[PDB]
């Protein structure tokens, strides 16, 4: 019952901090990250860091109720999970290839991942949202500005952070929109928000739970999600486990217990509320 668990940093779900001057204190848990010595070697060191956040508090509650201990580590081969040349990388890959018993974080449940890992019941609703400057007129993902962007002079400028569940959905559903958007790929959420705030981007398409958190914390309440926080292709965040995992039954029941007794609502108040 000592389990290898993988995570990925994505505030406020998983937040990574440097260790004290030399253990993890307060509401943090130890988490390690493999860091290369240089680029001409495979040699590296596990660096001891500290992790906290909404998903970490869920892990702490699961560890206590389900009765397991764990060795938490940060994924270094990709991010959430993408199938590249039929091989899964990121958190999904760590679980698929049995390096981790489970993956905890801002991990989106989708059909293709569910074919290779089992997911727990969802603990947070997510999907796709559209972030814009307040007042921008867009009807949703079906808006002609997104579907047929060159029908506008100048064309609407919009992008996502590639290789995650959002880009996969756009590629599957809207082929033209997808090939158009790639020139607007953002390195991460922080870069995308700066691009929107400075008028270099008109819309940012990304994970609903993250966008709704970011809109709620925006300085001047300038950036909002369209349709008053509308969520397209609704899914949720789930704990990924190996297919046929003996831990799935107890994890599912504990998550449903936390929702039922108000423990989940208490975590949302602690980590996900915003002024906007």
């Amino acid at each position: 019952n000592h389990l290898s668990i993988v995570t990925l940093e994505e505030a406020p779900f998983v937040i990574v901090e440097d260790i004290d001057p030399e253990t993890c204190v307060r509401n943090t848990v130890p988490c390690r990250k493999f860091v290369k010595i240089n680029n001409s070697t495979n040699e590296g060191m596990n660096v001891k860091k500290c992790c906290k956040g909404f998903c970490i508090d869920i892990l702490k509650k699961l560890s206590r109720t389900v009765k397991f201990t764990y060795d938490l580590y940060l994924v270094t081969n990709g991010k959430h999970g993408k199938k590249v040349n039929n091989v899964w990388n990121g958190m999904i890959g760590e679980v698929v290839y049995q390096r981790a018993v489970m993956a905890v974080g801002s991990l989106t449940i989708n059909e293709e991942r569910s074919e290779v890992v089992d997911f727990s019941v969802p603990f947070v609703e997510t999907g796709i949202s559209v972030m814009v400057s307040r007042g921008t007129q867009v009807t949703g993902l079906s808006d002609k500005k997104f579907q047929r962007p060159h029908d506008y002079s100048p064309p609407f400028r919009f992008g996502t952070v590639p290789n995650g569940s959002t880009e996969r959905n756009i590629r599957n559903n809207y082929p033209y929109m997808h090939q158009y958007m790639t020139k607007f790929n953002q390195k991460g959420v922080e870069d995308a928000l700066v691009s929107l705030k400075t008028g270099k981007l008109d819309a940012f398409i990304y994970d609903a739970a993250v966008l709704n958190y970011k809109a709620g914390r925006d300085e001047g309440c300038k950036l909002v999600t369209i349709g008053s926080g509308y969520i397209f292709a609704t899914t949720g965040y789930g704990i990924a486990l190996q297919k046929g995992s003996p831990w799935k039954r107890q994890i599912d029941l504990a998550l449903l217990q936390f929702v039922g007794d108000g423990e989940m609502e208490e975590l949302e108040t602690l980590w996900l509320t915003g002024i906007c």
Binding site: E115, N169, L256
Partner: protein, 281 residues
């Protein structure tokens, strides 16, 4: 390998109507001009508790019937639909022995192979059956007659009750389970257990008839009801959030493919289209 599906009457998820004289279903069309898909569902006629039940073919349609048709097409199974004999969703009651009633009991006894209905996923039921990934996310809210003043779940008329302001839910439902388990709601639970209704339709009617001052139920059902019956309104937001899933026995060979089909339908807009067709407007 013909699946027995159990359902329950619950607009807009499951509409239940009499068949025509010839035993077929009335041909109907949506606002889009598309034909309404209907299935024959056998069930008892409305009767008082403790009475013999007489089973007759009826017509079934709605969000959950469209969902069943899509699952049957994708997974290549045939089926027969029946309405839950006792008219209930399902709770576990003490008889040392404990037994499940409603659709829960039917599935566990093999009378049904799948529950296709607005069935709330909760810890109590998941201990005994397998739920698919959710097909709808919603929660609990309160229905009142327009003019009734309630702030919500924290209203003193709810938290400190008397025989002057009557509120209730549906018997042997997930709401009944929620209020019974949560000790913080025990004052509310004790008031409700005196006035709970046999069905959501009876409770909604009682609110209209001024027999019930507040009805505590599923927001996906109450908001649809309020949007049609303009003499009724929901009060506040959701005080609790929950999802609906498909119910199957833990050893079902269809469990993985049910959830994959549900995920595919969320991702390609099919579920959003069903929601727009039935639950919105």
């Amino acid at each position: 390998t013909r699946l027995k599906i159990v359902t329950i009457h619950q607009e807009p998820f499951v509409y239940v109507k009499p068949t025509l004289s010839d035993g077929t279903c009335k041909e109907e069309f949506t606002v889009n001009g598309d034909p309404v898909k209907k299935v024959i569902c056998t069930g008892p006629n409305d009767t008082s508790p403790g009475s013999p039940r007489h089973t007759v073919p009826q017509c079934c349609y709605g969000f959950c019937i469209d969902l069943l048709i899509k699952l049957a097409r994708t997974m290549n199974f045939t089926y027969e639909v029946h309405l839950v004999a006792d008219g209930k969703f399902g709770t576990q009651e003490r008889v040392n022995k404990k037994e499940w009633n409603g659709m829960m009991g039917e599935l566990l006894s093999g009378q049904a192979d799948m529950i296709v209905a607005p069935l709330t996923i909760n810890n109590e039921r998941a201990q005994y059956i397998e739920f698919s990934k959710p097909f709808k996310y919603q929660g609990l809210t309160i229905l009142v007659k327009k003019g009734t003043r309630i702030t919500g779940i924290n209203d003193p008329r709810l938290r400190n009750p008397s025989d002057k302001f009557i509120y209730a839910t549906v018997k042997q439902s997930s709401v009944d389970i929620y209020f019974r388990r949560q000790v913080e709601l025990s004052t509310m639970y004790r008031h409700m257990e005196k006035h709970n209704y046999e069905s959501a339709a009876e409770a909604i009617q009682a609110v209209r008839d001024n027999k019930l001052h507040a009805f505590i139920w599923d927001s996906a059902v109450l908001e649809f009801e309020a949007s049609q019956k303009c003499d009724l309104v929901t009060t506040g937001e959701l005080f609790f959030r929950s999802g609906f899933g498909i119910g199957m026995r833990k050893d079902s060979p269809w469990k993985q493919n049910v959830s994959l089909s549900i995920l595919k339908s969320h991702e390609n807009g099919f579920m959003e289209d069903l929601d727009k067709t039935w639950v919105r407007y």
